[PDB]
Design a protein around this ligand. Structure first.
Ligand SMILES: CN(C)CCCC(=O)Nc1ccc2ncnc(Nc3ccc(NC(=O)Nc4cc(C(C)(C)C)nn4-c4cccc(N)c4)cc3)c2c1
Length: 260
C-alpha cells in the first residue's frame, strides 16, 4: 500500500455509467466534496495485480492533457478513482447534440490539446496503441484529455496491424485517422469498406479523400500522418505547434461555412 491508497467509506457510488467484461464504471463522490469516476473489478474475473497495473501507469504519466488518477483501493472489492470528465467520451460528444454546432476552430483546438498530451507521451517514450475519438475524454470548456477505456484495424498503422511494430509513429498514424473523425463529426473512417478491404487497399496505396469543406492544408497534414515509412511521419511536437498556430500561420484566410 502507498500514499494513493484510501478507505472505501470515503467513497460514495451514485450513478452507473456502463458495464464491461471485468467490472463497472460508476460516477460518484469522494469525501462528500468531489465529482469522481470509479472503475470496478468483478471479483475473480482477473488477477488483482493486473487490474492495478492500469494504476501503475496512471501514476508514472501525469500531465494536464492526460487523465489524472486520484486514488486506489487495493483490498477486494477493488477500485480505481480518477477525475470526472463531464461531457464524457469525445466520440459520443461529436455525434450528439453539440455536433452540428462545432466548427473548424473548435475542432482544431480539440485536436491541438490531444496532440499536446500525445506530445508528452512522446517525451516519456510511452506508446499508446489505441488512440482515437473513443478514447478521448471531454470536460468543461472543451478540455480534451487522452484516456483509455480498455480489432481497431481502421485506426491502426499497417506495420502494427500486420507485424506488431507498435510505436509512437504508429500512434501518429491513428492521430491522422482521429482528424477525419473530428472533421466528419464522429463518422467511421473508410465508409462502405469491410475490415479486409482496408488492409488490402491501404497497402496498395489508398488513402482517405479530403472530407467536404475541409481545407486542403488540413487533409495534407493527414497524409503526412499516413506516410508508408514510419520514420517519414511527423512528431507529435510538430503537430501540436502546427495546430496551435493554424489560423495565423497556415489558413488566415479561413471562411466559416455550413458545417465547418
Ligand atoms: C459509449 N457511450 C454511449 C457510453 C459511455 C459511458 C460513459 O459515459 N462513460 C464515462 C463517462 C464519463 C467519464 N468520465 C471520466 N472517466 C470515465 N471513465 C474512464 C476514465 C479513465 C479510464 N481509464 C484510462 O484512462 N486508462 C488509461 C489511461 C492511460 C494513459 C493516460 C494512456 C496512460 N492508460 N490507461 C490504461 C492503462 C492500462 C489499462 C487500461 N485499461 C487503461 C477509463 C474510463 C468516464 C466514463
Amino acid at each position: 500500500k502507498d500514499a494513493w491508497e484510501i478507505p472505501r467509506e470515503s467513497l460514495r457510488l451514485e450513478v452507473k455509467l456502463g458495464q464491461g467484461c471485468f467490472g463497472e464504471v460508476w460516477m460518484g463522490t469522494w469525501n462528500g466534496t468531489t465529482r469522481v469516476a470509479i472503475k470496478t473489478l468483478k471479483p475473480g474475473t482477473m488477477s488483482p495485480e493486473a487490474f492495478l497495473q492500469e494504476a501503475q501507469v496512471m501514476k508514472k504519466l501525469r500531465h494536464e492533457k492526460l487523465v489524472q488518477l486520484y486514488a486506489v483501493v487495493s483490498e477486494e472489492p477493488i477500485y480505481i478513482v480518477t477525475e470526472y470528465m463531464s461531457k464524457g467520451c469525445l466520440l459520443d460528444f461529436l455525434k450528439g447534440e453539440m455536433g452540428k454546432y462545432l466548427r473548424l476552430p473548435q475542432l482544431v483546438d480539440m485536436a491541438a490539446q490531444i496532440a499536446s498530451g500525445m506530445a508528452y507521451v512522446e517525451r516519456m517514450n510511452y506508446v499508446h496503441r489505441d488512440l482515437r475519438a473513443a478514447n478521448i475524454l471531454v470536460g468543461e470548456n472543451l478540455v480534451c484529455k487522452v484516456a483509455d477505456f480498455g480489432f481497431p484495424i481502421k485506426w491502426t498503422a499497417p506495420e502494427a496491424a500486420l507485424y506488431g511494430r507498435f510505436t509512437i509513429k504508429s500512434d501518429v498514424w491513428s492521430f491522422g485517422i482521429l482528424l477525419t473523425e473530428l472533421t466528419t463529426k464522429g463518422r467511421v473512417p473508410y465508409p462502405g469498406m469491410v475490415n479486409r478491404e482496408v488492409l488490402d487497399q491501404v497497402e496498395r496505396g489508398y488513402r482517405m479523400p479530403c472530407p467536404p469543406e475541409c481545407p486542403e492544408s488540413l487533409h495534407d497534414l493527414m497524409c503526412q500522418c499516413w506516410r508508408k515509412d514510419p520514420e517519414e511521419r511527423p512528431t507529435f511536437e510538430y503537430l501540436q505547434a502546427f495546430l496551435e498556430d493554424y489560423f495565423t500561420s497556415t489558413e488566415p484566410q479561413y471562411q466559416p461555412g455550413e458545417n465547418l
